[PDB]
Design a protein around this ligand. Structure first.
Ligand code: CA
Ligand code: CA
Ligand code: CA
Ligand code: CA
Lengths: 103, 153, 51, 103
């Protein structure tokens, strides 16, 4: 049984030394990073915190992020484990209607 | 959102948390609610059950039709996280957990980078960064600024 | 319902203009670290007055 | 199985005799305090109550405190087990608006 301290599904040594996700047939593999074969495919190299279930502290595990098992609305640049995925919600008031309360 | 209507400089007319009428089910990033083609929602009421008008008194009413200064602050925003369910793959919203639990955690452990090379609109990303004094935070991968620019923007 | 005030109180206030605000107590919840998935979660049961 | 009466994850003898947390690769260890190797690294020596899950009685375990598995808003001086981490909330009234209720 491979070690996994943060319980996120990515093995610790993979998280520290680098890794990547790659479909082979129609299934995704979580391969450890390899210069000779992955770099040609344009696969991103991922590093994350072995001890944090989410490295960015946002509510999506590093595994969920890199494999895409995630809320799809999460914008693609935030799919990367080191990029925090959080809402920024501001309200703007398009116009204000007062009605005088007069008998 | 907990909006607050402010007369003049900083005399707060009223603080209103949104009611069921003003609730927005989803708000995907780079989206408006209601969607930008539709007319904006009406905040009318102070009551939990949306049954009382947002009242304003005489001096406030006179000051408003004179100066016409009515700012709207956004004190805070309530909302829930939808999380992926490994079992049947559906994303589900936990109404227990909410973003106010998560956001301060994010702001306290990530470098913030605001950047406006995209048509001079500010874009704020947050990149996980080592915190030397916090033992758990040193376990994050080292973050050069160039790497941050590449992966975030 | 408005925070109401009666006539003698109203007169006394526009005369003396003394309206203090005491903070008798504060309600609030603790967010605790969840060892499983690392998220900090707020228990609405537990609250700081216990602690 | 090492003894742990307060169930907080720090072994009793470690709690009494002193201890410290230290990353080695990208993982934190909860080492017993050692003069010759830890003092040079500037690591704080920690002591806590073996029998109290939190020594300061605040709702964060001594383990959670020293290892940083904690609410991040907890200010750094209170990360130390002997320093209580509690809110102090006072309300100040910036101004008071009376409106005379007159027909
Ligand atoms: Ca892991
Ligand atoms: Ca991780
Ligand atoms: Ca113990
Ligand atoms: Ca203890």
């Amino acid at each position: 049984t491979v070690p996994d301290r943060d319980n996120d599904g990515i093995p610790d040594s993979l998280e520290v030394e680098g890794y990547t996700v790659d479909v082979k047939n129609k299934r995704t593999f979580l391969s450890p990073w390899i210069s000779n074969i992955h770099e040609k495919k344009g696969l991103t190299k991922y590093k994350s915190s072995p001890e944090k279930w989410s490295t960015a502290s946002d509510p999506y595990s590093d595994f969920e992020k890199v494999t895409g098992r995630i809320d799809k609305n999460v914008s693609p640049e935030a799919r990367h484990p080191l990029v925090a995925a959080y809402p920024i919600v501001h309200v703007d008031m398009e116009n204000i209607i007062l009605s005088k309360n007069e008998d | 959102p907990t909006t607050s209507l402010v007369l003049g400089k900083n005399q707060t007319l009223a603080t209103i948390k949104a009611k069921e009428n003003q609730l927005s089910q989803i708000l995907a990033p780079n989206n408006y609610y209601p969607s930008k083609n539709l007319a904006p929602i009406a905040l009318n009421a102070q009551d939990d059950f949306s049954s009382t008008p947002i009242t304003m008194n005489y001096n406030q009413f006179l000051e408003l039709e004179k100066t016409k200064q009515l700012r709207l602050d956004t004190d805070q925003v309530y909302g829930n996280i939808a999380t992926y369910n490994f079992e049947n793959g559906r994303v589900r919203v936990d109404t227990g957990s909410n973003w106010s639990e998560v956001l301060p955690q994010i702001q306290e452990t990530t470098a913030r980078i605001i950047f406006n090379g995209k048509d001079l609109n500010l874009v704020e990303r947050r990149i996980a960064a080592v915190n030397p004094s916090d033992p758990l935070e040193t376990t994050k991968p080292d973050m050069t600024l160039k790497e941050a620019l590449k992966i975030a923007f």
